[PDB]
Amino acid sequence: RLKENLPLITLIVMMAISWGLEQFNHPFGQLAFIATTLVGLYPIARQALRLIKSGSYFAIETLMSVAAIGALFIGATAEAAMVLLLFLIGERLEGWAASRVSALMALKPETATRLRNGEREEVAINSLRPGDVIEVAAGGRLPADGKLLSPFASFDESALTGESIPVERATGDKVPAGATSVDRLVTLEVLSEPGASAIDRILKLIEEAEERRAPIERFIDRFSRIYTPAIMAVALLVTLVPPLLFAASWQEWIYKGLTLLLIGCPCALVISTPAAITSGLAAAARRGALIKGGAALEQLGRVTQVAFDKTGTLTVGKPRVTAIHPATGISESELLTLAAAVEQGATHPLAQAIVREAQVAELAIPTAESQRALVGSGIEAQVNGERVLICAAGKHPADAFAGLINELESAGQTVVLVVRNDDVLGIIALQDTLRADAATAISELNALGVKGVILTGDNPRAAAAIAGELGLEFKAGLLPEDKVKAVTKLNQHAPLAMVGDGINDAPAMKAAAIGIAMGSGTDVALETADAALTHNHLRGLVQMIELARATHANIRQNITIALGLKGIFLVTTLLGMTGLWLAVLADTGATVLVTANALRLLR
Ligand code: ALF
Numbered sequence: 001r002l003k004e005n006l007p008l009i010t011l012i013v014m015m016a017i018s019w020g021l022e023q024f025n026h027p028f029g030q031l032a033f034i035a036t037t038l039v040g041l042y043p044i045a046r047q048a049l050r051l052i053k054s055g056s057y058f059a060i061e062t063l064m065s066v067a068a069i070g071a072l073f074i075g076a077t078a079e080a081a082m083v084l085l086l087f088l089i090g091e092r093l094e095g096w097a098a099s100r101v102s103a104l105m106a107l108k109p110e111t112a113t114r115l116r117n118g119e120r121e122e123v124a125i126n127s128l129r130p131g132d133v134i135e136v137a138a139g140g141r142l143p144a145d146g147k148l149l150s151p152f153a154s155f156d157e158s159a160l161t162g163e164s165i166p167v168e169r170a171t172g173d174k175v176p177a178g179a180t181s182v183d184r185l186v187t188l189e190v191l192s193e194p195g196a197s198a199i200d201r202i203l204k205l206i207e208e209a210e211e212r213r214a215p216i217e218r219f220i221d222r223f224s225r226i227y228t229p230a231i232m233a234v235a236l237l238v239t240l241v242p243p244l245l246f247a248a249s250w251q252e253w254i255y256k257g258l259t260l261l262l263i264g265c266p267c268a269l270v271i272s273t274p275a276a277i278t279s280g281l282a283a284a285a286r287r288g289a290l291i292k293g294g295a296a297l298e299q300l301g302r303v304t305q306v307a308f309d310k311t312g313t314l315t316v317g318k319p320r321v322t323a324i325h326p327a328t329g330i331s332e333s334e335l336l337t338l339a340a341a342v343e344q345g346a347t348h349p350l351a352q353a354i355v356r357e358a359q360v361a362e363l364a365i366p367t368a369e370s371q372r373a374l375v376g377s378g379i380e381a382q383v384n385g386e387r388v389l390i391c392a393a394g395k396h397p398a399d400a401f402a403g404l405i406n407e408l409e410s411a412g413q414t415v416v417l418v419v420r421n422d423d424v425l426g427i428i429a430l431q432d433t434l435r436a437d438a439a440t441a442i443s444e445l446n447a448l449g450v451k452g453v454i455l456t457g458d459n460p461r462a463a464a465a466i467a468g469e470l471g472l473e474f475k476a477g478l479l480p481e482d483k484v485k486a487v488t489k490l491n492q493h494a495p496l497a498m499v500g501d502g503i504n505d506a507p508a509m510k511a512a513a514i515g516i517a518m519g520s521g522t523d524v525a526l527e528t529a530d531a532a533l534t535h536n537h538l539r540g541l542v543q544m545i546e547l548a549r550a551t552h553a554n555i556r557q558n559i560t561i562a563l564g565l566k567g568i569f570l571v572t573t574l575l576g577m578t579g580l581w582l583a584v585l586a587d588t589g590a591t592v593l594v595t596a597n598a599l600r601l602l603r
């Protein structure tokens with residue numbers, strides 16, 4: 001697993017020891033150097049050789065191998081060894097900056113419970129045929145896309161919408177695989193073939209997105225494609241031109257040409273980009289960021305747009321009561337203590353929100369008796385003698401709260417009614433609220449010229465409230481495929497980062513230049529993403545985008561340094577005022593410089 005580092009160490013030891021043999025009995029030591037040079041040159045020579053076969057004649061590996069082989073014939077073994085060492089360090093630095101679908105596979109159960117002849121049987125998920133009647137227990141995931149046979153049921157379809165608010169479904173309604181039966185036990189007619197469920201379609205979206213990802217070419221190869229054949233041509237010329245036109249020594253100009261091949265090897269340049277990225281990834285890691293591989297850092301560097309998920313990303317992902325409006329003769333705390341009295345024990349996030357609000361206010365929740373679900377209306381219990389029902393605003397006559405209810409709902413709120421003996425005792429508003437640092441984070445992104453857009457699977461109103469708060473545009477009521485399409489459309493215009501916390505964000509994340517997951521997000525999200533906000537602080541996005549950008553600057557400086565000195569020591573060499581060892585020393589100095597520069601990212 002770590003045999004990648006071995007050639008480096010072996011080259012080091014072999015080097016130092018070869019020097020030790022240049023301490024007693026030189027000629028025996030030069031053979032040892034030739035051994036070092038050859039063993040370090042081996043993987044690079046065969047690697048290059050494979051590249052020549054694949055059409056690619058002039059990768060940097062070619063230049064390196066040719067220059068080493070030439071340096072062998074001219075006893076520049078110590079130097080060739082040195083440059084090989086630098087190259088190996090660059091290669092390894094690059095290798096360490098490399099990224100190391102199970103979480104989504106865990107969403108498909110392994111067995112289903114099938115019903116035949118009034119007998120239950122546990123079968124493999126792929127044994128399921130359309131028309132089969134399957135039975136999902138409470139809390140269980142649908143193994144396949146089903147049509148509800150049960151009269152009524154609520155489902156957590158967050159794996160498709162990102163919303164944990166249970167969806168009321170009745171006989172005939174389609175329920176997608178991965179959905180969760182929240183309270184009851186359901187029966188469904190399987191609709192989907194094996195391998196063709198909603199989860200499977202998500203997986204397919206992810207795979208396709210990953211396949212459409214174009215690999216970015218390194219600077220060094222685009223460069224080498226012109227530089228390498230150039231300095232080879234020139235070295236041929238400094239070999240041919242002088243003896244053919246000045247009647248000079250073939251030996252000395254052949255020698256000189258090969259020396260130019262070794263000189264031409266741009267050390268520092270190979271360590272140029274890897275040194276920055278290694279520092280950047282190390283700096284991000286130090287301040288609560290998580291980036292998987294250098295390519296991710298480069299993409300992060302070239303990003304100018306952000307697409308946000310809403311629920312769990314921009315918002316805390318939990319309902320919270322925002323307003324309490326009682327009827328006359330009733331205090332807000334009475335309406336609240338009554339609602340909490342009914343809702344206690346219920347798992348519906350709105351109920352939990354109400355109970356919470358009662359608890360932070362130190363309102364003692366009275367015991368409820370005969371608590372039950374009033375199916376398709378709401379949940380009902382009797383508190384201190386009287387039957388009180390808490391229900392959705394569309395389930396009961398508003399009478400005298402109509403206008404207020406409309407006002408609340410248009411503002412992106414969710415309203416529940418408290419009703420005792422068919423009297424509306426008052427309403428309660430709830431909303432999924434913004435995270436503490438969402439606003440400032442957005443404003444900072446805008447300061448960096450990075451515009452945000454919102455892609456959410458939530459309803460238009462709930463979205464429009466939040467997007468209203470942050471001054472962003474939005475697309476709402478979106479399924480995963482729709483997010484992928486939106487993201488593609490935007491990403492064709494400019495490189496985009498997708499920030500989400502949900503399974504349904506996963507395909508979008510892969511469709512974007514870079515996907516970024518919230519810390520509290522779904523495992524699928526954290527695994528699909530190229531990066532992670534381990535703290536759930538949205539501000540830590542700007543930092544990332546800042547760091548990345550600084551990194552992209554650092555590189556550009558480094559290259560210049562590496563490419564500048566080289567140039568100088570290229571031209572001087574061509575004027576005949578500088579030699580091999582000086583050029584090696586200079587490339588080494590260049591390397592020290594780009595290193596020291598790369599270390600500035602740590603500040
Ligand atoms: F959390 Al969402 F669309 F708002 F997945």
Ligand SMILES: [Mg+2]
Nearest residue numbers: 162309501502
């Ligand atoms: Mg989400």
